Design a binder for this molecule. Structure first.
Ligand SMILES: Cc1cc(/C=C/C#N)cc(C)c1Oc1nc(NC2CCN(Cc3ccc(S(N)(=O)=O)cc3)CC2)nc2ccsc12
Ligand SMILES: [Mg+2]
Lengths: 556, 412
């Protein structure tokens, strides 16, 4: 017999104030009882479980299940109640590596570490809470009562404790074979290396010879997989990766559940298939919950879907990461708040692709959205590769410099270069910093009645030009914008505008280039046609002329 | 020091469960090396999966030093750690620190690692060095000693610090020493000549008690509410007068007795913005009376220690930033302006981060606490970049301004 090291037990407690589970065992058929007795006798011989006396007051129900061709039963212990009562753990498995962040390895193998799982002992003081009862035949004797000595399948703490235990066992092996990489998830263990295959299979042998010091049996994974390896939705070839094939169904009747799983496929595909778009197909789900409702796909949703089918026409592939090369991210504007991007090291060999969609807002502009896309890609790149990429952006350097030097917020984007691929992001208007000599001055005002919603909007100018239009179904805020719009419509290419509307100044000083308000949009289109606009603000109701005269004109 | 001080969270709240944000590879590597040495020195230990807590960590470089330093973001733990009446029921913030000619900031965070942390509280100091690309589980640690940046550390160390310093204080009754978090602030009315010496005099005095070569020198002789200033002009356009009436109307919410009637009357009719309007005598007098009102201090401002301090910042362009500190709107307790942010002439965010640190420092000197910032920046831009330029071992709270304030005009 060879001494094996004990695996260090993790201390576990129940949530404060909570006791263990006390759930009654369901009655079972005579055949299920017989099958459960057979199974638990075997588990008991392997040290997994142990018989307890009647002193333990906790209980978790146990069931017997089957399958189609599997002519025998398996044991299911239902730990739902215990899991609700068990303390929270550090669960350290929630993300997986992105293939584009991986480095190519000459050799890679998968190990099955399923057996090692139940050689992880369970904290002694916690076992009592795992008790379960095999009901007796005809209920004429006491039930056979057992508790777990190892992490039970289904118990809340078993994934984190098993993973944490393996990590600690593996740490010496990894740290002292720096030419190896080891990755663990579920009961699978992945080893990769750049060793010729002779010495790789021996490092594998050394690894089970390391695992055996804790008495952990690890054979080669039964029925091995060969290139590509299929893993977490990907295909990993030795020198390239891609996603598992994406198939979009044809349907003449789409439901909201059909659609939201079309977006999921498209979202999945968008990490390597450049230019995927999902806004129009996401638009058909803004607000609904009974998810077999049919939706007419708009012809805008159909063109988007048909555009997606064309990009999906082919397989595409990404390459693995080379740390000795630069990391580059290029972004293109797609329209309607949509952006796409490719991350690469050599031209035409993408590491991965992606997309970004405009946040929900009343008004917005292209430069702000490009900035957000940059920040999203920055953070993703830090996750994946541990560094910020150099950016190639469809915005002229002078456009950016004008934007950030004049914009009222602080803003910044990291090292980047202009790439001349239309449509380019541009500033569509810029207001004057000073009043314009020789340009006509328009004093604008609007006003509406709360009850009737009847309003007026208009202007008076230093040349005696004047206009007031009566309006229905309006509000003060709309009349204030409508007045600015009238002044832009009726003036020459250079114009000074004086308003008392803090609301309208707040919108325009935000520099939107597109809006949810058709009226704001009309103002933007006018601004674009102008050569110079100066917008001045004055307080209302304070006797300042022009503003005084137009105020009386529009206030009934 | 063998005997730990018992510490608890506030009643009915668990420890922090804050997500670690992603880190670049060079910061991860720096943190691995620092923590390996800390773990060898007993200051931190590896923890197991039964600890579900987490506090974020990153790595910085203190102002113009080239060695990485670990910074733990204890904001959540500090909010959840019991209020501290440690050996006192309150340590008077020295109201005379803000008046001293020169104040030097000394990092003494290293002294905290001499004191064990309560064994029952250690699990709440959990933090994670993240992996790149989820390629390994993060490295999980908890503190065994008082950590830098935690609210309880100056509180629990206060008994030792006052005794370490008392021989120096006995010799120097002129010198104010104030502790906030990891830093000592040392003020004197004498010139930098003998100030540096006394600073190193104090510094080597810490060496004989079981230290850091760095400092930072402030002059709180400046710190006021800046006056509202009106233009002095020989010819006024319509536009100039409109801007003046707008500024005065804004100031009438702060100051009583501001009048714009006689100035507004100059704007009779519908005139071109660039047309020159002579000032009458009545408008001239009104302007003069307004000028007279604005040189006196604002009526009814003082600091309520029960209330948050709020700090607002405006980007003014060309490297200039204005700010105001207040508790109630229009009752500014301090206003200020910065320019030429060092090594940042093309990076707005770096400039903003330095201004935030500069304002927080003034706030600690004046009141002994940090303000809640209203930052003129979109959240995703700030959240992506601020840690890149942060150099302080404390971190204030902040919120984001998405609508441009008209008041920027009035502070420019
Ligand atoms: C994350 C990960 C996944 C797998 C999946 C297996 C399956 N199902 C395997 C390993 C080692 C993983 O973990 C890491 N993988 C890498 N690189 C990879 C290694 C594998 N190649 C693909 C490949 C190479 C050679 C052959 S071959 N010639 O033997 O048939 C077949 C396939 C892609 C890059 N780097 C790291 C760094 C830290 S962990 C880790
Ligand atoms: Mg009006």
């Amino acid at each position: 017999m060879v001494p094996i090291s004990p695996i260090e037990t993790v201390p576990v407690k129940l949530k404060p104030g909570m006791d263990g589970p006390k759930v009654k065992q369901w009655p079972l058929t005579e055949e299920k009882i017989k099958a459960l007795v057979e199974i638990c006798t075997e588990m008991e011989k392997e040290g997994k479980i142990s018989k307890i006396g009647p002193e333990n007051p906790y209980n978790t129900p146990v069931f017997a299940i089957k399958k189609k061709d599997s002519t025998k039963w398996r044991k299911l212990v239902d730990f739902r109640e215990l899991n609700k009562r068990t303390q929270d753990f550090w669960e350290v498995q929630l993300g997986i590596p992105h293939p584009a962040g991986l480095k190519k390895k000459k050799s890679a193998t998968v190990l099955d570490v399923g057996d090692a799982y139940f050689s992880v002992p369970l904290d002694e003081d916690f076992r009592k809470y795992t008790a379960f009862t095999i009901p007796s035949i005809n209920n004429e004797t006491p039930g056979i009562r057992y508790q777990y000595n190892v992490l039970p399948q289904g118990w809340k703490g078993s994934p984190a404790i098993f993973q944490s235990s393996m990590t600690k066992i593996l740490e010496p092996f990894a740290a002292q074979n720096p030419d190896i990489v080891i990755y663990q998830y579920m009961d699978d263990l992945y080893v990769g290396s750049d060793l010729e295959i002779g010495q790789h299979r021996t490092k594998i042998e050394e690894l089970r010879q390391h695992l055996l010091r804790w008495g952990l049996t690890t054979p080669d994974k039964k029925h091995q997989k060969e290139p590509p390896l299929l893993w977490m939705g990907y295909e990993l070839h030795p020198d390239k990766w891609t996603v598992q094939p994406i198939v979009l169904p044809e349907k003449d009747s789409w439901t909201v559940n059909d659609i939201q799983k079309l977006v999921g496929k498209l979202n999945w595909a968008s990490q390597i298939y450049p230019g995927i778009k999902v806004r129009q197909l996401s638009k058909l789900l803004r607000g609904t919950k009974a998810l077999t409702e049919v939706i007419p796909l708009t012809e805008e949703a159909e063109l988007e879907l048909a555009e997606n089918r064309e990009i999906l026409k082919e397989p595409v592939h990404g390459v693995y990461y080379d740390p000795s090369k630069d990391l580059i991210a290029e972004i293109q504007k797609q329209g309607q708040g949509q952006w796409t991007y490719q991350i690469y090291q050599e031209p035409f060999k993408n590491l991965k692709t992606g997309k970004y969609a405009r946040m929900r807002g009343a008004h917005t502009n292209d430069v702000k959205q490009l900035t957000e896309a940059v920040q999203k890609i920055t953070t993703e790149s830090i996750v994946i590769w541990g560094k910020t990429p150099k950016f190639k952006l469809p915005i002229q350097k002078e456009t950016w410099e004008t934007w950030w030097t004049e914009y009222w917020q602080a803003t910044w984007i990291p090292e980047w270069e202009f790439v001349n691929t239309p449509p380019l992001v541009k500033l569509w208007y810029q207001l004057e910093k000073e009043p314009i000599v020789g340009a006509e001055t328009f004093y604008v005002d609007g006003a509406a009645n709360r009850e009737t919603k009847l309003g007026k909007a208009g202007y008076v100018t230093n040349k005696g030009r004047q206009k007031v239009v009566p309006l229905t179904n309006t509000t003060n805020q709309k009349t204030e914008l409508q007045a600015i719009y009238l002044a832009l419509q009726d003036s020459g290419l250079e114009v000074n505008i004086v308003t008392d509307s803090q609301y309208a100044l707040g919108i325009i000083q935000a520099q939107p280039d597109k809006s949810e308000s058709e009226l704001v949009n009309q103002i933007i289109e006018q601004l674009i046609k102008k050569e110079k606009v100066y917008l001045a603000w004055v307080p209302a109701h304070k006797g300042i002329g022009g503003n005084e005269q137009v105020d009386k004109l529009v206030s009934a | 020091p063998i005997e730990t001080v018992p510490v608890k969270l506030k009643p009915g709240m668990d420890g922090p469960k804050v997500k670690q944000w992603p880190l670049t590879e060079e910061k991860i590597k720096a943190l691995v090396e620092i923590c390996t040495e800390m773990e060898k020195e007993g200051k931190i230990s590896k923890i197991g999966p039964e600890n579900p807590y987490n506090t974020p960590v990153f790595a910085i470089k203190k102002k113009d030093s080239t060695k990485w330093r670990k910074l733990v973001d204890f904001r959540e733990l500090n909010k959840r750690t019991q209020d501290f009446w440690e050996v006192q029921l309150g340590i008077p913030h020295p109201a005379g620190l803000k008046k001293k000619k020169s104040v030097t900031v000394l990092d003494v965070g290293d002294a905290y690692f001499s004191v064990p942390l309560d064994e029952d509280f250690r699990k709440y100091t959990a933090f994670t060095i993240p992996s790149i690309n989820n390629e390994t589980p993060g490295i999980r640690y908890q503190y065994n000693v008082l950590p830098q940046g935690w609210k309880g550390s100056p509180a629990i160390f206060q008994s030792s610090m006052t005794k370490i310093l008392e021989p120096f204080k006995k010799q120097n009754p002129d010198i104010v020493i104030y502790q906030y978090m990891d830093d000592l602030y040392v003020g004197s009315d004498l010139e930098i000549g003998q100030h540096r010496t006394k600073i190193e005099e104090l510094r080597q005095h810490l060496l004989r008690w079981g230290f850091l070569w760095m400092g930072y020198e402030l002059h709180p002789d400046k710190w006021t509410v800046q006056p509202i200033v009106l233009p002095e002009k020989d010819s006024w356009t319509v536009n100039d007068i409109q801007k003046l009436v707008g500024k005065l109307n804004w100031a009438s919410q702060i100051y009583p007795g501001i009048k714009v009637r006689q100035l507004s009357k100059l704007l009779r009719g519908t005139k071109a913005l660039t047309e020159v309007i002579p000032l009458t005598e009545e408008a001239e007098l009104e302007l003069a009376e307004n000028r007279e009102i604005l040189k006196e201090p604002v009526h009814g401002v003082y600091y309520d220690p029960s209330k948050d301090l709020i700090a607002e910042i405006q980007k003014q362009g060309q490297g200039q930033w204005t700010y105001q500190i207040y508790q109630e709107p229009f009752k500014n307790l301090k206003t200020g302006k910065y320019a030429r942010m060092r090594g940042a002439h093309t990076n707005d965010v770096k400039q903003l981060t330095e201004a935030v640190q500069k304002i927080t420092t003034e706030s600690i000197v004046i009141w002994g606490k940090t303000p809640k910032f209203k930052l003129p920046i979109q959240k995703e831009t700030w959240e992506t970049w601020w840690t890149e330029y942060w150099q302080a071992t404390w971190i204030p709270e902040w919120e984001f301004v998405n609508t441009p304030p008209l008041v920027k005009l009035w502070y420019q």
